[PDB]
Amino acid sequence: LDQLRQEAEQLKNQIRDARKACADATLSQITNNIDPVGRIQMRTRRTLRGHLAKIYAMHWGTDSRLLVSASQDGKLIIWDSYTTNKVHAIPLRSSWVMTCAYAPSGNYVACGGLDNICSIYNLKTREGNVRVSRELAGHTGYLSCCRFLDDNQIVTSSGDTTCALWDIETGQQTTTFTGHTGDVMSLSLAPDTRLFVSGACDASAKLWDVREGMCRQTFTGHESDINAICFFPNGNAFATGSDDATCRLFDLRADQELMTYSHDNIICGITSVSFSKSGRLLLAGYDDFNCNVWDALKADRAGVLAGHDNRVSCLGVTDDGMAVATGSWDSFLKIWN
Amino acid sequence: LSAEDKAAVERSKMIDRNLREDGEKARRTLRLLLLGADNSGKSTIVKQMRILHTSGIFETKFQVDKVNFHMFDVGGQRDERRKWIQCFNDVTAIIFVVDSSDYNRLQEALNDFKSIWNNRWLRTISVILFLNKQDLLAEKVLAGKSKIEDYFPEFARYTTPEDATPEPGEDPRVTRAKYFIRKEFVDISTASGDGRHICYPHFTCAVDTENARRIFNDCKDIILQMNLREYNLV
């Protein structure tokens, strides 16, 4: 009852005092010395026109080529981005797919959605056709995100407020991470794959240790659902975007919000967030049909993509650093650089 | 291009061909989203039963006049629905089922209808309202043990409209209660939406077996109104 609420009440007050003590100079004042990146003009080089319904997810392959994408038409598509060739087309058992992932080895693709099942498909088989290697066990809510740790380990986030770590070989939940309050909407892996962050509908993000399965840290500051999350390339910070039309850059070590990216002229929610190769450019897709490119340090709109006719749903920068691919509800994927 | 590049382009073209064929085949049929609280008979609206894709969300398939309807019921979770609903912003219609027999939860159903109607993503989707279990409503109003005025004071000052047409020769009090109950929902619907999407109330009971015909007719009306919107008659 209230006996333990007081114990938790003082703990919340104390940690806030630690955060205020830790902060002396804001990030903006520190970075005021440097010169701005300047206007960033980015052009469309390819347009992928095979999807017959709105697209919810895409994931770049590790070879800076062969991206994968998922839409409500009940189809996964593996594209050769250089030539716009359709390498693979995978039928889905359930057309309600909300996420898709590409194995870093390039041998598997994972997709899940309203069916509560994270399917893993094998790309490289002797038979020559893509087959369902494993339908993973059940969540108690829809799947919002999934990412491959390796060819045998996957990490999923669900609408049952819980993330999970699965072994593909056994097909069982190796670890089940503790509860959020609301839906878990986003998920990002650290570069070393030792930690990972999750964003929830409770306007909070949580940093988790994969090996021990216990929430290491918790970050707050948003005002609505957190829709997207992404580590900094060096793994010491991460940015989130929420329905309150704002992005936040938090730092893991300082355990405190570092920067906020918002503009009075922007009011729609943010659907996707990703960084550039050096982390200076923060790319965010919005609900008003266009993406924005912010200077991650000086925090100003360095550019606009502005090429989609509908809601921008998914957004991803290639590992090599050449290009950024955005997929929208107009059933189109566009590659920019 | 080399020989391998040409063969890859050919394979991509074949993939495109299959994609378009599947797309037109899928575009042929109609898709509905079924909503309503428990203890409302939302699974009994259409007599035919199915267990299509029972994992996760629930699928039903029924054919009327040689046109196929796929009804999706996201019944796995009893929690907030505000997130996955945006995946359904392209269905033909939202079939909202309300059990009008019980007056205790009726305000909750009205609030749910208000939340659905004024949703940001469903601002262009028509709602087909099914007032289920009208026989229990008639029995309750005829018994007189429980009164609407305990929960709705305005029912004291409400009177049946001159356009009321009680067809089966029912009691006037039953018709008065039914029309007030439907009036609450149509008042919620009319306060916003400005004709972009409209509600189609209906009355039904558990033993009723003609709900498929009503769904088909109102879907035809929705398609007709979108067509007239395309040619800019509206």
Epitope: D80, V87, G128 | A3, E10, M14
Partner: single-chain antibody, 232 residues
Framework: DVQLVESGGGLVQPGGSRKLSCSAS????????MHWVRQAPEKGLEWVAY????????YYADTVKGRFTISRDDPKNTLFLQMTSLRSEDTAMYYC??????????????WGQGTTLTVSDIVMTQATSSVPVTPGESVSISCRSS???????????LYWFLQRPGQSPQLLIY???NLASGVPDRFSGSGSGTAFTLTISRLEAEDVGVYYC?????????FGAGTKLELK
């Protein structure tokens, strides 16, 4: 359990007609282009014909152009070769080869058993036709092309095939330096855009056989003379 069994070979009179069939099982046949490849009884491999996936593209060799027809039946998973005006040079083994083409595919991955038949361009040069060798030591086999095989996209198309005695050929390197699936890692391929070398680090008893290098830059497809490795 990929399997391709062909039939139809037999004794025929010169100028006759014949039909060769090949049933495919264990794989998605309709998604694979298919090849007919000739091996003369005492000479090396020679490409004959190629049917594409979906029958969109058909390619023939000059020596059999017009009088040979290649056809495919997906529902029965079957391949047909109709041969007319048979000659003495058309007596061969007639292997059937699988193939698939996308960004990272490995064409010519699987080969059929072949059926002996008897009757009543870029040049591939192999410097050596035989190399005596002892097990346990490194070996290198080089071949050369008239025209550089390196396309503008950065891919150079040379394939390495090992045919053990009394066996159908198998693929080893499906590009410049791309090891095929199921091939032990001791094999490797290297070289420039015109001269290409296959390198084997350690030799066992199963490595004895003929080695062919093939080009795939453009049609027709031409094989090498073949380097024979025998244990010693």
């Amino acid at each position: 359990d990929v399997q391709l069994v062909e039939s139809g070979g037999g004794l025929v009179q010169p100028g006759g007609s014949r039909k060769l069939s090949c049933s495919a099982s264990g794989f998605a046949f309709s998604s694979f282009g298919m090849h007919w490849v000739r091996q003369a009884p005492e000479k090396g491999l020679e490409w004959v014909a190629y049917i594409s996936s979906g029958s969109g593209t058909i390619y023939y060799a000059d020596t059999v152009k017009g009088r040979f027809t290649i056809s495919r039946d997906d529902p029965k998973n079957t391949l047909f070769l109709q041969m007319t005006s048979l000659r003495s040079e058309d007596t061969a083994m007639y292997y059937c080869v699988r193939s698939i083409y996308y960004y990272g595919s490995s064409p010519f991955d699987f080969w059929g058993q072949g059926t002996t038949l008897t009757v009543s361009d870029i040049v591939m040069t192999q410097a050596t036709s035989s190399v005596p060798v002892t097990p346990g030591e490194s070996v290198s086999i080089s071949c050369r092309s008239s025209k550089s095989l390196l396309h503008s996209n950065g891919n150079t198309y040379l394939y390495w095939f090992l045919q053990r005695p009394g066996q159908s050929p198998q693929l080893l390197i499906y590009r410049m330096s791309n090891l095929a699936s199921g091939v032990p890692d001791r094999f490797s391929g290297s070289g420039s855009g015109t001269a290409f070398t296959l390198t084997i680090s350690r030799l066992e008893a199963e490595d004895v056989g003929v080695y062919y290098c093939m080009q795939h830059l453009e049609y027709p497809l031409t094989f090498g003379a073949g380097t024979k490795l025998e244990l010693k």
